[PDB]
Amino acid sequence: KKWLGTPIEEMRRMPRCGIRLPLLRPSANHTVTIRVDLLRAGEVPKPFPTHYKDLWDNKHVKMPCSEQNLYAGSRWELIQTALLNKFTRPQNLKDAILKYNVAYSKKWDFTALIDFWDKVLEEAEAQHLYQSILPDMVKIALCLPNICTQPIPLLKQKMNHSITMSQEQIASLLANAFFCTFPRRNAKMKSEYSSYPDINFNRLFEGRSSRKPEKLKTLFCYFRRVTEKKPTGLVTFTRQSLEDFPEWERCEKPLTRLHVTYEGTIEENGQGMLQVDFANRFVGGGVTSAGLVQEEIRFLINPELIISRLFTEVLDHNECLIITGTEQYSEYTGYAETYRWSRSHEDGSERDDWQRRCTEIVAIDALHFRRYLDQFVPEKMRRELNKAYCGFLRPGVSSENLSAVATGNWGCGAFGGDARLKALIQILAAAAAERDVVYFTFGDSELMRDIYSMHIFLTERKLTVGDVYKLLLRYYNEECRNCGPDIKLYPFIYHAVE
Ligand SMILES: Cn1c2c(c(=S)n(C)c1=O)N[C@H](SCCN1CCOCC1)N2
């Protein structure tokens, strides 16, 4: 069989499982950058306030259009002068970006941009790029002060805060990131923003990886779509930091339901479910540089995710980022060296009452294990349980209104995670958050069978979260602490219980 466990049709999903949203409203913990009183299906949202207001300080994004962005001269004026020239050759665009980035004229390589334009694209495609797409991108970038009129707070460490903005606002901000206009975000030895991801796209232009043309095709598909026809919806970005975590050894909650399959994907088959992003602590990972596995791919086919890098501080152990409403603009095949842009995607997701696409993604970063056995240390197991639990828990929401979790081999691959341990950690964390699990093994049919078999074994014997966590602790003591191990985890568990 291609899938085991509970039928996926029986799992909860949005919008059907959600409660009616309250009235969207700004508050101390919710920044809203549009006119809620004018929000209407199929209309471009109106920015609030009407006229640009600037904050240039330690708690907000430093906007390129700020009067305090100086070089004294006005850097915004220089950006306007640089970008409003006709581009007919890729050197023109390199020279323009470097006019307001003089300090990086040696450090920043543009080989991938030059090669995309001159050596990948056919003549007609290149003409469309520089006669239509790039000029349209410049115009939406330079509209920033009329589009993003309200200061954007940083989602700093330990903040429990949300930002809701329009897709159109995000497009203006991402156009600025493409043209590398965000100040104070470039220096290798920067301090103010050293704990924040890169936002400017300059590393997307460097080098000769065969992957860069596919990244650029994916992003220009998005740019071509959102400059041609303004998107009308909203997107919410929520930083969540929990202080009260389970006493896992004492948790008497039962396990929840499981659907596990080695076919399908989170983004296609997990529609309306809580979709896990296998994140870097710096959200988005290498999306704007080198990096093209699960997180980067999702950030490329849903580019509105990328703007989280503008304002999201590196995630601490007890934190996650929840993004609701991003739209899928691209389809793809493969991953890493085999990733290819396929075609434009027409997102058919419903929108909720805040005009957000019914797509919820949570970025949770797994640990990186130098040594395989390190991940069975109890402190490290607890850390991953608590990270997933934070990602899955929705304070204030009842379990019947919680979609299933759509996830997979989180932190396995480059990070060195063991898939069978990580599957059980997510199953336990979901159980504690009272959500069902939809698990994609991405071609690994044996893993599907193994996860299913363990899950049904444990549920039929009515073992609790705490019962299972204590078995993980026994495995650490017996096979790992004084030890790769002589016996694998699931065999150990079956033997210990039987
Ligand atoms: C869309 N998608 C997806 C993956 C997974 S696992 N899942 C569940 C998914 O839905 N992997 C790939 S990218 C790197 C490949 N690695 C192989 C499996 O270990 C994790 C990552 N893309």
Residue numbers in the entry: 451 to 521, 532 to 943, 947 to 961
Sentences from the paper on this structure:
PARG, a single gene alternatively spliced to generate five isoforms, is an endo- and exo-glycohydrolase that rapidly degrades PAR generated by PARP1 to coordinate DNA repair. PARG hydrolyzes α(1′′-2′) O-glycosidic linkages in PAR chains to release ADP-ribose and oligo(ADP-ribose) chains that may signal genotoxic stress. The hPARG active site has two deep pockets that specifically engage the adenine and diphosphate group of ADPR.
JA2131/NSC98003 contains a terminal morpholine in place of the pyrrole of JA2-4 and shows improved activity, which may derive from a polar interaction mediated by the 1´-oxygen of the morpholine. The 6´-thiocarbonyl group of JA2131 is another driver of inhibitory potency. JA2131 and JA2120 bind to the adenine-binding pocket of hPARG in the same orientation as JA2-4. As for JA2-4, the 6´-thiocarbonyl of JA2131 makes a direct van der Waals contact with the main chain amide of Asn869 (3.6 Å) from the conserved macrodomain fold. Notably, the 6´-thiocarbonyl group of JA2-4 series inhibitors displaces this water molecule to form improved interactions with the adenine-binding pocket of hPARG. From the protein-ligand interactions identified here, the 6´-thio-methylxanthine derivatives JA2-4 and JA2131 compete with the adenine moiety of PAR substrates for active site binding. The results show JA2131 treatment induced a 9 °C stabilization of PARG proteins in cells; whereas, the PCNA control showed no significant change in thermal stability in response to JA2131 treatment. JA2131 did not inhibit PARP1 activation up to 100 μM; whereas, a potent PARP inhibitor Olaparib completely shuts down PAR synthesis by PARP1. These results, together with the observed extensive physical interactions between JA2131 and its binding site on hPARG, support the conclusion that JA2131 selectively inhibits PARG activity.
